[PDB]
Amino acid sequence: MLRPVETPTREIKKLDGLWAFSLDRENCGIDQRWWESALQESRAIAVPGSFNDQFADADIRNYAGNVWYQREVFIPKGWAGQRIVLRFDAVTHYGKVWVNNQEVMEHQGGYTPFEADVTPYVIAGKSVRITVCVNNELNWQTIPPGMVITDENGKKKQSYFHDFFNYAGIHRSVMLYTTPNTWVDDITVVTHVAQASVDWQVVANGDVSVELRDADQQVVATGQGTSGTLQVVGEGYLYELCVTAKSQTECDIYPLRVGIRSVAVKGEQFLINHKPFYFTGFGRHEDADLRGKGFDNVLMVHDHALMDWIGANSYRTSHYPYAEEMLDWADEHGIVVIDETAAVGFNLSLGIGFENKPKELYSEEAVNGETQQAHLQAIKELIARDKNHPSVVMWSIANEPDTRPQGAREYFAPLAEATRKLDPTRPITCVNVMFCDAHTDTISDLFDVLCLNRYYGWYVQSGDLETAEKVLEKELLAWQEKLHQPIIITEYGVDTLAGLHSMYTDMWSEEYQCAWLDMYHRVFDRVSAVVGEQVWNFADFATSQGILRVGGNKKGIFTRDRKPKSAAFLLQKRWTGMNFGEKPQQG
Amino acid sequence: MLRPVETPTREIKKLDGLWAFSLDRENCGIDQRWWESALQESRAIAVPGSFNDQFADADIRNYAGNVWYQREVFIPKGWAGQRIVLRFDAVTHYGKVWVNNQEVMEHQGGYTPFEADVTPYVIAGKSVRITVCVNNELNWQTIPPGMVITDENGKKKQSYFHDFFNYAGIHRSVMLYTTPNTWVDDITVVTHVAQASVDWQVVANGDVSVELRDADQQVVATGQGTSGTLQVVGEGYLYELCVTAKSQTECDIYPLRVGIRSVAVKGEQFLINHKPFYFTGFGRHEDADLRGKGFDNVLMVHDHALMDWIGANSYRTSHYPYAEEMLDWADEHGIVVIDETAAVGFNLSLGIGFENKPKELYSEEAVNGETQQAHLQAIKELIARDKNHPSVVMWSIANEPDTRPQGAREYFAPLAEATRKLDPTRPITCVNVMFCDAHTDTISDLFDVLCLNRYYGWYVQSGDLETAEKVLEKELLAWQEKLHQPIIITEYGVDTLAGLHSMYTDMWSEEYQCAWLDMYHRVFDRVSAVVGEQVWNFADFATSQGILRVGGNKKGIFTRDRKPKSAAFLLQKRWTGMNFGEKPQQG
Ligand SMILES: CCC[C@@H]1NC[C@@H](O)[C@H](O)[C@H]1C(=O)O
Ligand SMILES: CCC[C@@H]1NC[C@@H](O)[C@H](O)[C@H]1C(=O)O
């Protein structure tokens, strides 16, 4: 499965915004089969957006259970001789959908599309009732995991183990799509460099021809057959190889953009086209002021303008798969992307407070075999749909897992190996949490380049930069000599509320963010193996409520409404001072 | 008159803090001679402090009229054979005081001490009732001027024409002081340099000897007689010449600290000891979070620590005489000080809004002959008590007067000339307001070095730095060629609320403060005659309420509680980058 693009392939975008929405507090929907009649006592909701914060209501915001969307649609008239298929680009956590009293789809996965042919349940020209049942619950076999808890009164409350807030709803595009009656499924392409080759595979209903055209889209070379190899002689050139499906009586044309993408890892260097690289940029989040994680074109354009100004050339889709629009953008603009799945919270050592969670991390009570297989499904879907993007430069299996407990490597080994089985073109990482240090972590052996999320001077060095530097440097050198891999610091940052200034350079002040980030920068400058720096969050984002979070995680370089803290000008001076992709040497 | 210093001269500081305080809303005090009995229905007040904000009450804060202080004191026992005299170091606007049913003092002037012998109304060992009547009203014969307005109901409301808020009360030290029965009044010293001479004058009751001792206080030379001359062979050396009064039967010793102070103005240079200088620093204010203008040692130590860190070597006592403690401090620490009197608001062209003020500035209705003589008294008192301070480097007659109307120079000429008559040792200035530009101002001819308060890019160039630079530079060159004087930019700054960040570098944001101040700095770098830069306010301060002021004037480099905005690090980088007293040349 890959993204619908239009040519003699058509669609009616159904991000019509306003659907009928209703909560299901007493779980009556399935039994009264609500999809059967117009929702009783509904309210208007926006459909590219989370349902949590759109109504300024704490009881919808913290709601756990089943919610219901509904929307009627007229199917276009020129589709009577076509297959009508219905695609949701992201339903966060779980979705099941009924096209007029007949059930059509079901899917467990919050950041990946799922589609299904409904041509035998539609006829072009008339109006059908679409009803969606969305679930936002997490158990130990979900990606990410969690524990629902039902109190004395029967009220559900969801507990989880990741920082960001558990936003849910229809966060991305809904889509009615038609394609000619022979070509259905997937295409895959792989690219090589010689210090200039390709490959093709199409799955459709008949003969296939493929022609690579360039940005002027004049044909630069053509083959036809499911496989073989053509050759050819800040932001990146994207050719376009146009694959055609000659068969039955109708032809089908699909355009797939390809970039000359190359890379594996070599010793201590993350090369690109046989070129050393330094990652600069951010751990991101899909989080905005009123839409939750809902995608929005304005926000995307503005935050790319911000990363462009600040000099970042890369980022990482922190803790879940992102809106594909962003990877198409990264394609055209030459942004380097670390693709991560929703597998966060595999750790019960991070929660901090005054408050019964399972005692053995890897076991049947928690992360079991079912968990490992749901995980492998998540990696499967992320690779299945982002495989042809040039901007995806590395896969990341999970984020900050607890690898101290027994059973950790028995769990993660088949996943690393299987993912290498899923695509050998790009490297494999697993971002490492602070407390599984160099002397302790179990799984770093299995990955190509190890990524570190370290916060010396914040969570563990009590605001004392002068010792934090020393600790961070030992640990740096230790990691490299233990694995002689490239080191990408994927998370590093401190909570700072915009407006707090202090002569004493204290924690939470803007001066402290500046000083802390630049001391980290000084040690980066001095160790061979660090090939990347991505600060911990570009903007402030929302989290669940707790004594550690003042209205959200304030570790951002920008505020939630995208206004710059002082450190935004620190980074801008450093990241645009170096030349592109090259690390500042030691002074 | 000069400050009491203790040796065989004694005192009991009466900043005992808590006095009895009462408002007099229906003007009953004088007629019921309240000083006669303990105040009826009083509340505790602090006496180094303004009465306005100490009670968190809007009706005391905006009160106009008469207020009453009271406090009983036991006179020390070892004073029975002495003159007991009572000194208030500052009663803001007007004060009259009764020592136990007998009236002893009266004074019109808010920032200068006034004292009086009350030895025949006291006897050592017993307790006396001190009652003070403090008035906070301004008319056109006050320094500064104003207009009280009585509405339909008989309620007074005070109108004035200066930015800062009209704080009042006992703002500085109260003091019981004793000195031996021969020496009463003044001493004056004058110092010269030869690319090393002095003079003396004592007024007392009998023969005088004087001996100059140095910081090790070993006598370095001695004379005796009211006059003559001795000679000798970042922060400044302060000798100490100890003047003694030999007479009657009792001797009296007064210690007066002297600094080798030198300077007049030469062409386009403000020399010091025949050395070109660049003023750096601030226009200040006496304004803090709960004391109003009340002096406080902690605040003084901290804000000197801030000016020291930031690299400022100078400041100007904006719009009234300061606490003498600060000029003693500036003495020991080598801070250069522009001494200004309370003569602000001689201008009716500055108020901006939607709201009957007199039509002719210089005339009998407003600033008349009585006004000119009250003014000359104010200059008289400021020079009379700050004449021997080395840190005072220049007198400033007034701040931002309206010189366009007819009669302006007829008013200001006898004042400039008279002040030059009051002390020829230090130069004379009159800070100039924006709208009396180089082609218009009437009085700049009469002063030694002209000081400019300019705000291009804020009040008159609508937030457009790129035109503001050009305007400011023409006007610069124009001023110099018109007078070939040194130019000290005494005010330049913009309102910026800490916390407002903006990618667009808009007005009120911290980025705009940084950009604006540094563009001003670029033009300063390029014009010969500017010999000084003092930004408009070090910290945010309170003003009266209006649509132009958000909780006060936000033009400060620091917030009112002394926290640094981003520009505090801009200035610190520039003012400590140059060497001391030398201007950065053009790049
Ligand atoms: C010490 C663990 C740090 C943690 N790392 C994972 C991110 O998802 C969180 O945002 C980050 C944080 O605490 O902000
Ligand atoms: C354009 C006149 C500016 C004015 N200059 C006098 C200062 O007393 C004020 O504080 C300052 C201001 O507006 O802030």
Coordinates of C-alpha atoms in Angstrom, one line a residue, chain A residues 104-387:
Chain A
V104 CA -16.2 -2.6 5.9
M105 CA -13.1 -2.0 7.9
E106 CA -11.2 -2.4 11.1
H107 CA -7.7 -1.4 12.1
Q108 CA -5.5 -1.3 15.2
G109 CA -2.8 1.3 14.7
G110 CA -2.8 5.0 15.2
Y111 CA -0.4 6.5 12.7
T112 CA -0.7 4.3 9.6
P113 CA -3.4 4.3 6.8
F114 CA -5.8 1.5 6.2
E115 CA -8.0 1.2 3.2
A116 CA -10.6 -1.2 1.7
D117 CA -12.6 -1.7 -1.5
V118 CA -16.3 -0.8 -1.0
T119 CA -17.3 -0.8 -4.7
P120 CA -20.0 -3.5 -4.0
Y121 CA -21.5 -1.4 -1.2
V122 CA -21.7 1.9 -3.2
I123 CA -23.2 3.1 -6.4
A124 CA -22.1 6.3 -8.0
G125 CA -24.4 9.3 -7.7
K126 CA -26.1 8.7 -4.3
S127 CA -25.4 9.4 -0.7
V128 CA -24.1 6.8 1.8
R129 CA -23.8 7.0 5.6
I130 CA -20.2 6.6 6.9
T131 CA -19.9 5.7 10.6
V132 CA -16.6 5.3 12.4
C133 CA -16.0 3.9 15.9
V134 CA -12.7 5.1 17.3
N135 CA -11.1 3.7 20.4
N136 CA -8.3 5.3 22.4
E137 CA -7.4 2.6 24.9
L138 CA -4.0 1.1 25.5
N139 CA -3.2 -2.3 26.9
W140 CA 0.1 -4.2 26.9
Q141 CA -0.5 -5.5 23.4
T142 CA -0.9 -2.0 21.9
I143 CA 1.6 0.2 20.2
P144 CA 2.3 2.1 22.4
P145 CA 1.4 0.1 25.5
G146 CA -0.6 1.1 28.6
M147 CA -2.9 -0.1 31.3
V148 CA -6.6 0.8 31.6
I149 CA -7.8 0.9 35.2
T150 CA -11.5 0.6 36.2
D151 CA -12.1 2.1 39.6
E152 CA -14.7 1.3 42.3
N153 CA -17.5 3.0 40.3
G154 CA -16.8 1.3 36.9
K155 CA -15.2 4.5 35.5
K156 CA -12.3 3.8 33.1
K157 CA -9.1 5.8 33.4
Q158 CA -6.1 5.2 31.1
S159 CA -2.6 4.9 32.3
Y160 CA 0.4 4.9 30.0
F161 CA 4.2 5.4 30.2
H162 CA 5.1 8.0 27.5
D163 CA 5.6 11.7 28.0
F164 CA 3.2 13.2 25.3
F165 CA -0.5 13.3 25.9
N166 CA -2.7 10.5 24.7
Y167 CA -4.5 12.4 21.9
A168 CA -6.9 10.4 19.8
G169 CA -9.5 10.8 17.0
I170 CA -9.3 11.0 13.3
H171 CA -6.0 12.9 13.0
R172 CA -5.3 12.8 9.3
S173 CA -6.9 12.5 5.9
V174 CA -10.0 10.7 5.0
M175 CA -10.2 9.8 1.4
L176 CA -12.5 8.2 -1.2
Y177 CA -10.3 6.9 -4.0
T178 CA -10.8 5.3 -7.4
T179 CA -8.3 3.7 -9.6
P180 CA -8.8 1.8 -12.9
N181 CA -9.9 -1.8 -12.5
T182 CA -6.6 -3.5 -13.1
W183 CA -3.9 -2.0 -10.8
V184 CA -4.4 -2.4 -7.1
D185 CA -1.4 -2.7 -4.8
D186 CA 2.2 -1.8 -4.1
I187 CA 5.4 -0.8 -5.9
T188 CA 9.0 -0.8 -4.6
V189 CA 12.2 0.9 -5.8
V190 CA 15.8 0.6 -4.6
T191 CA 18.6 3.0 -5.5
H192 CA 22.5 2.6 -5.5
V193 CA 25.5 4.8 -6.0
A194 CA 29.0 4.1 -7.3
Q195 CA 31.4 6.4 -5.4
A196 CA 23.9 5.0 -10.2
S197 CA 21.5 2.0 -10.4
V198 CA 17.9 1.2 -9.6
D199 CA 15.3 -1.6 -9.3
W200 CA 11.5 -2.0 -9.7
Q201 CA 8.8 -4.3 -8.5
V202 CA 5.1 -3.8 -9.4
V203 CA 2.1 -5.8 -8.2
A204 CA -1.0 -5.3 -10.4
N205 CA -3.3 -7.1 -12.8
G206 CA -1.3 -7.3 -16.0
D207 CA 1.7 -6.2 -17.9
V208 CA 3.7 -3.3 -16.5
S209 CA 5.9 -0.7 -18.2
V210 CA 8.1 1.7 -16.3
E211 CA 9.8 4.9 -17.5
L212 CA 12.2 7.1 -15.5
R213 CA 11.7 10.8 -16.3
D214 CA 13.7 13.6 -14.6
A215 CA 12.5 16.9 -13.2
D216 CA 12.0 18.3 -16.8
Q217 CA 10.1 15.0 -17.1
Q218 CA 11.7 13.9 -20.4
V219 CA 12.2 10.2 -20.4
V220 CA 15.8 9.4 -19.2
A221 CA 15.4 5.6 -19.5
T222 CA 12.7 3.0 -19.8
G223 CA 12.2 -0.7 -19.0
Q224 CA 9.2 -2.8 -18.7
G225 CA 8.8 -5.9 -16.5
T226 CA 8.5 -6.2 -12.8
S227 CA 12.3 -6.0 -12.3
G228 CA 15.7 -5.1 -13.7
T229 CA 18.0 -2.0 -13.4
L230 CA 18.3 1.4 -15.1
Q231 CA 21.4 3.6 -14.8
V232 CA 22.0 7.4 -15.0
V233 CA 25.0 9.6 -15.8
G234 CA 20.9 21.6 0.8
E235 CA 17.9 20.1 -0.9
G236 CA 17.8 17.0 -3.1
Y237 CA 17.1 16.1 -6.7
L238 CA 14.1 14.0 -7.1
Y239 CA 13.6 12.1 -10.4
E240 CA 10.2 10.7 -11.2
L241 CA 9.9 7.2 -12.6
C242 CA 6.4 6.8 -14.0
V243 CA 5.2 3.2 -13.8
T244 CA 2.3 2.2 -16.2
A245 CA 0.2 -0.9 -16.1
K246 CA -0.8 -2.1 -19.5
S247 CA -3.6 -4.6 -19.3
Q248 CA -7.2 -5.8 -19.7
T249 CA -8.7 -3.0 -21.8
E250 CA -7.9 -0.1 -19.4
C251 CA -4.4 1.3 -18.7
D252 CA -3.3 2.6 -15.3
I253 CA -0.6 5.2 -14.6
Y254 CA 1.0 5.8 -11.2
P255 CA 3.8 8.4 -10.7
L256 CA 6.4 7.6 -8.0
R257 CA 9.0 10.1 -7.1
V258 CA 12.5 8.6 -6.5
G259 CA 15.6 10.2 -5.1
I260 CA 19.2 8.9 -5.6
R261 CA 19.5 7.5 -2.1
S262 CA 22.4 5.4 -1.1
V263 CA 23.5 4.8 2.4
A264 CA 24.7 2.3 4.9
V265 CA 27.0 3.0 7.9
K266 CA 30.8 2.7 7.7
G267 CA 32.9 2.4 10.8
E268 CA 32.2 5.6 12.8
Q269 CA 30.7 7.6 10.0
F270 CA 27.1 8.0 8.8
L271 CA 27.9 8.5 5.1
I272 CA 25.6 9.8 2.5
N273 CA 26.5 9.1 -1.1
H274 CA 29.9 8.1 0.4
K275 CA 30.0 11.5 2.3
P276 CA 30.3 12.0 6.1
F277 CA 27.3 13.8 7.6
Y278 CA 26.4 15.6 10.8
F279 CA 22.7 15.5 11.6
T280 CA 21.4 18.8 13.0
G281 CA 17.8 19.4 14.0
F282 CA 15.1 18.2 16.2
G283 CA 13.0 15.6 17.8
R284 CA 9.6 16.7 16.8
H285 CA 6.0 16.1 17.8
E286 CA 2.7 16.3 16.1
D287 CA 1.1 18.7 18.6
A288 CA -0.5 22.1 18.1
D289 CA -2.7 24.5 20.1
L290 CA -6.3 23.3 19.3
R291 CA -6.1 20.4 16.9
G292 CA -4.0 18.1 19.1
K293 CA -2.1 15.9 16.7
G294 CA -4.3 16.8 13.7
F295 CA -2.2 17.5 10.6
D296 CA -2.5 21.1 9.2
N297 CA -0.9 22.5 6.1
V298 CA -0.3 26.0 7.6
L299 CA 1.6 24.5 10.6
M300 CA 3.7 22.3 8.3
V301 CA 4.7 25.2 6.1
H302 CA 5.5 27.5 9.1
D303 CA 7.5 25.0 11.1
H304 CA 9.5 24.0 8.1
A305 CA 10.2 27.8 7.6
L306 CA 11.4 27.8 11.3
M307 CA 13.7 24.7 10.9
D308 CA 15.0 26.2 7.6
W309 CA 15.8 29.5 9.3
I310 CA 17.4 27.9 12.3
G311 CA 19.7 25.8 10.1
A312 CA 18.5 22.3 10.9
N313 CA 18.9 19.8 8.0
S314 CA 17.3 16.8 9.7
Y315 CA 14.8 15.6 12.2
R316 CA 13.3 12.5 13.7
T317 CA 9.6 11.6 13.8
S318 CA 9.5 11.2 17.5
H319 CA 7.5 8.3 19.0
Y320 CA 5.1 7.6 16.2
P321 CA 4.8 7.7 12.4
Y322 CA 4.2 11.2 11.0
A323 CA 1.9 12.6 8.4
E324 CA 3.3 11.4 5.1
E325 CA 2.9 14.9 3.8
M326 CA 5.9 15.7 5.9
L327 CA 8.1 13.0 4.3
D328 CA 7.0 14.1 0.8
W329 CA 8.0 17.6 1.9
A330 CA 11.3 16.3 3.3
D331 CA 11.7 14.5 -0.1
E332 CA 11.4 17.7 -2.2
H333 CA 13.4 19.8 0.4
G334 CA 16.2 17.4 1.2
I335 CA 15.4 17.0 4.9
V336 CA 17.0 14.0 6.4
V337 CA 14.5 12.0 8.5
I338 CA 14.9 9.3 11.2
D339 CA 11.6 7.3 10.9
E340 CA 10.4 6.0 14.3
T341 CA 7.3 3.8 15.1
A342 CA 4.8 4.3 18.0
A343 CA 6.7 1.8 20.2
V344 CA 7.4 4.1 23.2
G345 CA 6.8 3.4 26.9
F346 CA 8.5 -0.1 27.0
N347 CA 9.9 1.1 30.3
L348 CA 8.6 1.2 33.9
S349 CA 11.6 2.9 35.4
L350 CA 10.9 6.4 34.1
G351 CA 7.7 7.4 36.0
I352 CA 8.6 9.6 38.9
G353 CA 6.3 10.7 41.7
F354 CA 4.6 9.7 45.0
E355 CA 2.1 7.0 43.7
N356 CA 0.7 -0.8 41.4
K357 CA 2.4 -1.3 38.1
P358 CA 3.7 -4.7 37.0
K359 CA 6.8 -6.0 38.6
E360 CA 8.6 -7.8 35.7
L361 CA 8.9 -5.8 32.5
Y362 CA 9.3 -8.7 30.0
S363 CA 6.8 -11.3 31.0
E364 CA 3.3 -12.5 30.3
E365 CA 1.8 -9.8 32.5
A366 CA 3.2 -7.1 30.4
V367 CA 5.2 -7.3 27.2
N368 CA 4.5 -10.8 26.0
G369 CA 4.6 -12.7 22.7
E370 CA 1.4 -11.0 21.6
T371 CA 3.1 -7.7 22.3
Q372 CA 6.2 -8.7 20.2
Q373 CA 3.9 -9.6 17.2
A374 CA 1.8 -6.4 17.5
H375 CA 5.2 -4.6 17.5
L376 CA 6.3 -6.4 14.4
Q377 CA 3.1 -5.5 12.7
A378 CA 3.7 -1.8 13.6
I379 CA 7.3 -1.9 12.1
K380 CA 5.7 -3.8 9.1
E381 CA 3.2 -1.1 8.4
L382 CA 5.7 1.8 8.8
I383 CA 8.1 0.2 6.4
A384 CA 5.3 -0.9 4.1
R385 CA 4.2 2.6 3.4
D386 CA 7.4 4.7 3.8
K387 CA 9.8 2.4 1.9

